[PDB]
Amino acid sequence: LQESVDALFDNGRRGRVITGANKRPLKSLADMLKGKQGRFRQNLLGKRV
Amino acid sequence: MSWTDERVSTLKKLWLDGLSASQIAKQLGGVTRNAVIGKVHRLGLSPGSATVLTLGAHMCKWPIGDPSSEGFTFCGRRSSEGPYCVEHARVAYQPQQTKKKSG
Amino acid sequence: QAITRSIADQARTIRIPVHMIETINKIVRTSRQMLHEIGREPTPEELAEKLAMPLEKVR
DNA sequence: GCATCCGTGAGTCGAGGGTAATAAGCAGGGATTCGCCCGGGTGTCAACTCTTTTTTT
Numbered sequence: 001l002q003e004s005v006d007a008l009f010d011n012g013r014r015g016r017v018i019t020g021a022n023k024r025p026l027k028s029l030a031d032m033l034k035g036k037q038g039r040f041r042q043n044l045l046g047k048r049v
Numbered sequence: 050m051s052w053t054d055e056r057v058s059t060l061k062k063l064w065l066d067g068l069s070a071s072q073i074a075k076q077l078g079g080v081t082r083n084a085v086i087g088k089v090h091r092l093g094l095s096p097g098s099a100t101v102l103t104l105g106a107h108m109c110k111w112p113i114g115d116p117s118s119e120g121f122t123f124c125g126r127r128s129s130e131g132p133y134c135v136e137h138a139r140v141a142y143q144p145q146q147t148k149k150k151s152g
Numbered sequence: 153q154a155i156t157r158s159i160a161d162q163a164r165t166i167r168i169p170v171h172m173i174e175t176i177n178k179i180v181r182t183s184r185q186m187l188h189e190i191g192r193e194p195t196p197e198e199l200a201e202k203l204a205m206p207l208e209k210v211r
Numbered sequence: 212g213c214a215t216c217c218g219t220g221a222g223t224c225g226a227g228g229g230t231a232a233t234a235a236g237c238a239g240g241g242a243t244t245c246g247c248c249c250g251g252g253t254g255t256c257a258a259c260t261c262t263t264t265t266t267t268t
């Protein structure tokens with residue numbers, strides 16, 4: 001349970017949690033705001049017009 | 050069967066006081082099993098040297114005999130750091146432990 | 153029983169009853185057997201008569 | 212006071228479009244859900260009486 005909790009937030013510090021169907025690693029809340037969907041260039045600074 | 054004002058009252062009473070739902074329709078008469086369930090759902094409100102008592106810590110616990118028999122006791126000897134005794138530790142556990150795998 | 157009863161509840165990602173999943177497994181097994189020992193591919197029309205179920209249910 | 216080991220980075224706009232695998236069984240009891248039907252509140256109409264602005268006398 002503790003592993004699931006602290007992997008739901010980052011998913012990178014501990015062992016990687018990969019779904020059985022998809023071969024790509026899951027994107028937790030921390031990874032969602034770093035480079036892909038964070039405020040770097042996706043939503044906050046750079047957006048469609 | 051009927052669904053008068055008294056039919057719902059007796060049904061609610063018999064469902065509240067406690068009774069098998071299958072026999073509820075038979076006791077009321079006429080109403081089937083499916084009708085009473087729909088009504089309650091629609092309307093809502095649904096030998097050794099120690100016995101089994103004088104067994105202290107650090108003592109043997111290997112049973113001897115039958116528990117449902119007259120005389121059933123344990124060894125009760127110096128058997129610290131283990132549930133069973135040294136004389137039975139080699140007969141209870143797997144003798145000659147040889148197991149290994151990958152890790 | 154504990155491993156099979158729990159694998160069909162949490163791993164599916166959606167609420168699927170046990171009778172539904174067992175019927176799905178039986179239908180898949182019979183379809184594979186018919187496709188392997190009858191012809192090219194079993195049609196859903198004959199799957200109802202083979203399993204003795206209505207067409208609306210098998211569909 | 213140094214030697215060894217674990218995090219961050221990598222430009223930017225455009226094209227291209229959908230995906231994919233394993234598979235027990237049956238008996239008990241309840242909760243759920245789909246068909247029919249009586250029904251009472253909402254519409255859509257024949258059909259009986261005051262007012263009055265003239266248009267006729």
Ligand SMILES: [Zn+2]
Pocket residue numbers: 109110111124125133134136137
């Ligand atoms: Zn003993």
